[PDB]
Design a protein around this ligand. Structure first.
Ligand SMILES: Cc1cc2nc3c(=O)[nH]c(=O)nc-3n(C[C@H](O)[C@H](O)[C@H](O)COP(=O)(O)OP(=O)(O)OC[C@H]3O[C@@H](n4cnc5c(N)ncnc54)[C@H](O)[C@@H]3O)c2cc1C
Ligand SMILES: O=C(O)[C@H]1CCCN1
Ligand SMILES: O=C(O)[C@H]1CCCN1
Length: 1216
């Protein structure tokens, strides 16, 4: 067998001193980056005065010489929404290729009546883009009902003339302004005018982010054909006077990433070389555009090989972008200048500020990394730019600097920095087509500054230009953007010519982080410290992780029955790597049923001593354990990789989740628990193999910090990481008597659950095992005669709905991740993709293409995307399903598996096309995506279909349309909703995780109601209240008063006020996301009363929390509820046969102890969901107004909305 981690992530090449200085700066603190940039960018007082004068002169020219859209809005008195709607209509009309056909539709159909009847795809799919054009503001989703009303209004008001003006306007903008031309030939024809004036061109073919091999091939042949046209047109003018091309490496390969570095060097590089050879033959420039920060250093390896490749010698046209908003920029320049010296190639270096800023902020926060790879104050980027220009200007003999900027202050600084000696070929400026020409017409030419400018010229169809136009608009359209500020009359020219170098120098703290951007560690402020991740694009990190992972694999991992009295003897067997059964990970000694029973008794004995540790100190143990897990993360990664079969990426996220659970439950403890919140007693924690550290730790930590001693029964498959979690918790101060580890199979779990002193059970696993546990617990009562609490999380049949407004590339990436990450072994994994019929074939084609780019194998290589499934039995169960579907004639797409997978248990990622959602009749816990199609008019029926399964865990929706968001999210019944992003990796305290129905009992893990289920008297969670009063509750209280039941009416009004139904919160989290948490009704609650007053109290509790009820007809209490108001009657039914009248969402039971036990067994016998049952005696109802706790009669819903999905972050446009 191959040695573990011997090939984890070797770099493309040994890292030179220059390359290592780049990596060293990746996330350097901002206060450390700025001082050397300030020094490098310093210029004399005389030069600064001259530069300020030149900048003022340029800005006065810019301001001395009204957009088309603004004139259109003015002429027709359009509101903003009308302007946006008009541009959307224009865009749609321009999708009609024949001019005479389009004009006939406008005259005969659009102008005179309903446009809706004439134009499967919303008119307003791209309204966020047109919103930026019309208003300058980015709104991430589209209010399509507002736009529809506006379009009707403006057409009914102004008719064909306004439609014609909109069409002509959109036609000009999309054919001449956002692009230089639709085709390279058209673009070239339109370039002669400014070339004759002294401009040059570099054509941007607008391709990026290939998703499939076919995409990458299409972008390749597009580049090749453009180079021929550009080279023919250049006609020997050379690389400075003549035109060139720009390419994006992400366009040329579907897996352009550090994780796939070997594929990039083997497959992407020869494609770039072939394009460069063609550029060399025509002697034109070929520029490599710069993209996301985690692609910078990878691109250097391609640049290095290309510049050293003798087949390309004699040609100085190779170019390369460096982004001055990046902390590595000067060190990258040092590397490039040296590469130019070694190779003798005069590398064309385009210095830009950078196009991906808000995405870099979000990504670093999501990944919990040490700092950002970009600056956070715009002025820091400006100083960086000028500092890097100084470095480039000192090396014009070996590189060709190209200063791409629309900022007249930046321009003037560099123009004077470069001095008096100039010749074409020394350096140039650059600008964007349709944006920079007003400024650079004051620069180019002997009558101006006599410096050349190359126009970066987009080329593409309407579809191509619209795909990432938002990101392009934000380059010059944010509050701190020069172009935005020059168009703001409230900004003086003096403000615009302010010298960023001197402003930064005089700051109290030079280089301070922006005050309004949280470091990833500080996302939650004073509440708790965010867990920290690891940057798998950082060579230093990969190198250190490689050694730590190797060392982890040499360790003799063990797991033992750890009782309160010490380790216990038992049957010992090895633990095998699921990706390679030859790889022995460790040894587990499993627990006898006798010792499991003994462990519960020991935990009961020790319960008072643990409950007496004050809550703040119990929370301090959790915080200490979180620190230990953070420090141990590399070793924990190795164990999770080898024992549980996970990728490094998923193992990092899992250790983060464990750390977050510990810190979250610690903080929630400090916010809530007091002397009156007594523990339940011994809690049995049964954890799954798919999150063998995170959910293991989460359940145990919550029970411990709530004051309960814990019996920890890890999954049979994954005992070693459990034993390590216990070692850490004990090292952090949890006493051995408070946390006992019982490895073994389900007999151990069953022995623990059945033990008389077990006071509560926390289970995450299959529905069938949860149901067996429920039946066990229904035999028992607490010493107080009350049901044993069960928290059971049990998976789902998770769907994602995609309509024709979603961006296919985004969908496919989110589907590939949601369905096949962790081999589909997440409970949150995407199981059914639902595609609107009109886009289903294109998305399916792209999805299948992306599927075949996945690398399946043993997960001790960074390049592996999908690892093994956990066991041979899991494998066999999944495969049986796939073959059953195949045998029914369903189309099945599968990746081929390499021969090396035979030593482990692997299922290839699979796509199965179904006719209807009901064709899927069992949860298939593997990498198996089912795809159905739906007509848009049947959307509401589809949501019914999703709900009808009875599950309700995770759910995804991809749409830009507010009406569709409102409709779907109001009708779906699931606990974790995700809008325009993947549906996996719920984040503790941000997406509290847990569902309803067949998916679980709740309360949500990583949410504020969790600890309260683990004590006998629940506290009031932080922020847990609602000002809204259920109106049916109010009608019931009035009915009670009319009947003379004045005590119960008062109790009803109190329940109405105490209810947190209607709670609606936004939780702190990363930028570019809105994370919402809301309390809803659970559904229909089964009421099993014994007395009239008990029934009234039960009804008050259920109604106050928004529920309907089914009242047990065998109570004989029908006469107690005569003449109900119709509003209340609508919510009330009587049930003789509880099994026929379900599913229920919870239950309230009244009776003595044996009545409660009998009803509990009867409820456990109901098919379907495990009900969260609350029981009370008649006397308890009389004595305790909280006898039925309202916490457990509401349903928690988490919704995470990717607000950056339109292409950028509106909120961050204000942050500079
Ligand atoms: C010819 C040309 C080629 C280009 N090629 C590329 C490319 O290959 N790769 C690429 O990434 N982009 C590219 N760009 C875009 C460029 O990087 C800028 O995003 C854009 O041109 C605006 O910058 P500026 O100097 O024109 O104007 P400015 O208004 O001076 O600068 C705006 C820039 O400031 C930065 N910024 C804004 N807010 C903050 C903040 N809070 N903290 C730190 N920095 C901030 C951003 O980078 C933003 O774009 C190119 C631009 C041009 C004109
Ligand atoms: O599992 C164990 O026994 C200890 C020793 C090796 C690493 N953890
Ligand atoms: O996979 C997820 O979404 C999170 C929630 C459950 C455990 N990890």
């Amino acid at each position: 067998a191959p040695a573990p981690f011997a090939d984890f992530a070797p770099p493309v090449r040994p890292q030179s001193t220059l390359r290592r200085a780049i990596t060293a700066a990746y996330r350097r603190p901002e206060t450390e980056c700025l001082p050397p940039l300030v020094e490098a960018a310093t210029q004399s007082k005389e030069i600064r005065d001259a530069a300020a004068s030149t900048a003022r002169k340029l800005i006065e020219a810019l301001r001395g010489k009204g957009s088309g859209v603004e004139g259109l809005v003015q002429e027709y008195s359009l509101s903003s929404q009308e302007g946006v709607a008009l541009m959307c209509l224009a865009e749609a009309l321009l999708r009609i290729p024949d001019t005479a056909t389009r004009d006939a539709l406008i005259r005969d159909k659009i102008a005179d009546g309903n446009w809706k009847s004439h134009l499967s795809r919303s008119l307003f799919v791209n309204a966020a883009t047109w919103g930026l054009v019309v208003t300058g503001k980015l709104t991430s989703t589209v209010n399509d009902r507002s736009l529809a009303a506006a379009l009707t209004r403006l057409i009914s008001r102004c008719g064909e003339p306004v439609i014609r003006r909109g069409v002509d306007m959109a036609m000009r903008m999309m054919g001449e302004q956002f692009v230089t031309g639709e085709t390279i030939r058209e673009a070239l024809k339109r370039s002669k005018e400014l070339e004759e004036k002294g401009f040059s061109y570099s054509y941007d073919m607008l391709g990026e982010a290939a998703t499939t091999a076919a995409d990458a091939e299409r972008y390749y042949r597009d580049y090749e054909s453009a180079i021929h046209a550009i080279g023919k047109a250049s006609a020997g003018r050379g690389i400075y006077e003549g035109p060139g091309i720009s390419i994006k490496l992400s366009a040329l390969h579907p897996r352009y990433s550090r994780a796939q570095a070997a594929r990039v060097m083997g497959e992407l590089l020869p494609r770039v070389k072939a394009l460069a050879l063609l550029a060399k033959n025509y002697d034109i420039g070929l520029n490599i555009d710069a993209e996301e920060a985690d692609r910078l250093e990878l691109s250097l390896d391609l640049l290095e090989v290309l510049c050293l490749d003798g087949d390309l010698s004699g040609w100085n046209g190779m170019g390369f972008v460096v982004q001055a908003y990046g902390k590595r920029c000067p060190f990258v320049l040092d590397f490039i200048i040296d590469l130019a010296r070694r190779s003798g190639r005069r590398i064309m270096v385009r210095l830009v500020k950078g196009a991906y800023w808000d995405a870099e902020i979000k990504r670093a926060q999501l990944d919990g990394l040490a700092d950002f790879p970009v600056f956070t104050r715009k002025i820091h980027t400006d100083v960086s730019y000028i500092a890097c220009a100084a470095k480039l200007l000192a090396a014009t003999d070996v590189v060709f600097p190209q200063f791409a900027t629309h900022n007249a202050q930046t321009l003037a600084a560099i123009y004077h920095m470069a001095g008096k000696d100039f010749h074409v070929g020394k350096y140039e400026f650059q600008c964007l087509h349709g944006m920079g020409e007003p400024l650079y017409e004051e620069v180019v030419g002997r009558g101006k500054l006599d410096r050349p400018c190359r126009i970066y010229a987009p080329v593409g169809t309407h579809e191509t230009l619209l795909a990432y136009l938002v990101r392009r608009l934000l380059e010059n359209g944010a509050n701190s953007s020069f172009v935005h500020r020059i168009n703001d009359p409230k900004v003086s020219i003096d403000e615009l010519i302010a010298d960023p170098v001197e402003v930064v120098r005089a700051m109290p703290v030079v280089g301070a982080k922006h005050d309004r951007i949280a470091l990833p560690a500080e996302l939650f402020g004073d509440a708790r410290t965010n867990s920290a991740g690891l940057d798998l694009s950082n060579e230093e990190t990969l190198a250190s992780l490689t050694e730590a992972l190797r060392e982890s694999a040499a360790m003799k991992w063990t797991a033992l029955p750890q009782l309160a009295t010490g380790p216990a003897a038992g049957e010992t067997r090895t633990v095998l790597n699921p990706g390679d059964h030859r790889d022995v990970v460790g040894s587990v000694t499993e627990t006898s049923e006798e010792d499991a029973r003994r462990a519960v008794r020991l935990a009961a004995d020790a319960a008072p001593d643990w409950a007496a540790v004050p809550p703040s100190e119990r929370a301090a143990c959790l915080d200490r354990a979180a620190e230990l897990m953070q420090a141990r993360m590399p070793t924990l990664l190795g164990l999770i990789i080898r024992e549980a079969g996970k990728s490094a990426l998923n193992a990092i996220a899992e250790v983060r989740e464990a750390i977050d659970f510990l810190r979250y439950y610690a903080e929630q403890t400090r916010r809530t628990l007091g002397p009156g919140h007594g523990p339940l007693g011994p809690i049995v924690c049964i954890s799954p193999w798919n999150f063998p550290l995170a959910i293991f730790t989460g359940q145990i930590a919550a029970a411990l910090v709530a004051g309960n001693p814990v019996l920890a029964k890890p999954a049979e498959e994954t005992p070693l990481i459990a034993a390590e979690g216990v070692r850490i918790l004990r090292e952090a101060g949890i006493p051995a008597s408070a946390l006992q580890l019982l490895p073994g199979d389900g007999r151990v779990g069953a022995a623990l659950v059945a033990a008389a002193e077990t006071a509560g059970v926390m289970f995450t696993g299959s529905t069938e095992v949860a149901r067996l546990i429920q039946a066990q617990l229904a035999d028992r009562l607490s010493p107080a005669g009350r049901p044993i609490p069960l928290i059971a999380e049990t998976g789902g049949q998770n769907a994602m709905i995609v309509d024709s407004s979603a961006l296919a590339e985004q969908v496919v990436g989110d589907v590939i991740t949601s369905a096949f990450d962790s081999a589909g072994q997440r409970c949150s994994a995407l199981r059914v993709l639902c595609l609107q019929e009109d886009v289903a074939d294109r998305i399916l084609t792209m999805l299948k293409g992306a599927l075949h780019e996945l690398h399946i194998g043993r997960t001790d290589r960074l390049s592996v995307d999908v690892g093994p499934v956990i066991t041979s039995e899991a494998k066999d169960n999944i495969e049986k399903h796939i073959e059953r579907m195949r045998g029914l004639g369903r189309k099945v797409e599968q990746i081929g598996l390499a021969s090396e997978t035979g030593v482990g248990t692997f299922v290839p990622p699979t796509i199965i096309e179904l006719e209807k959602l009901s064709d899927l009749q069992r949860e298939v816990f593997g990498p198996v995506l089912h795809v159905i199609r739906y007509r848009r008019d049947d959307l509401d029926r589809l949501v019914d279909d999703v709900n009808a399964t009875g599950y309700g865990l995770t759910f995804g929706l991809h749409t830009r349309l507010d009406e569709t968001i409102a409709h779907v999210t109001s009708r779906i019944k699931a606990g974790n909703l995700y809008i325009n992003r993947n549906i996996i990796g719920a984040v503790v305290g941000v997406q509290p995780f847990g569902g309803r129905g067949l998916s679980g009992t709740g309360p949500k893990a990583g949410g504020p109601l969790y600890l309260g289920r683990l004590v006998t008297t629940a506290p009031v969670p932080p922020q847990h209240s609602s000002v809204h009063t259920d109106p049916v509750l109010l009608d019931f209280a009035k009915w009670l008063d009319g009947k003379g039941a004045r005590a119960e009416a008062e109790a009803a009004r109190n329940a109405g006020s105490s209810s947190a139904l209607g709670l609606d919160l936004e939780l702190p989290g990363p930028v570019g996301e809105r994370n919402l948490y809301t309390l809803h009704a659970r559904g229909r609650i089964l009421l099993v009363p014994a007395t009239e007053s008990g029934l009234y109290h039960q009804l008050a509790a259920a109604l106050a929390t928004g529920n309907s009820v089914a009242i047990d007809a065998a109570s004989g209490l029908q006469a107690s509820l005569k003449n109900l108001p119709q509003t209340v009657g609508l919510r009330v039914s009587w049930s003789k046969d509880w099994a026929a009248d379900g599913p229920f969402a919870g239950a309230l039971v009244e009776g003595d102890a044996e009545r409660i036990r009998a009803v509990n067994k009867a409820i456990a016998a109901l098919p379907g969901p495990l009900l969260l049952v609350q029981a009370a005696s008649s006397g308890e109802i009389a004595r305790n107004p909280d006898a039925y706790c309202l916490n457990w009669l509401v349903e928690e819903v988490s919704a995470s909305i990717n607000t950056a999905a339109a292409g950028g972050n509106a909120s961050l446009m204000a942050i500079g």
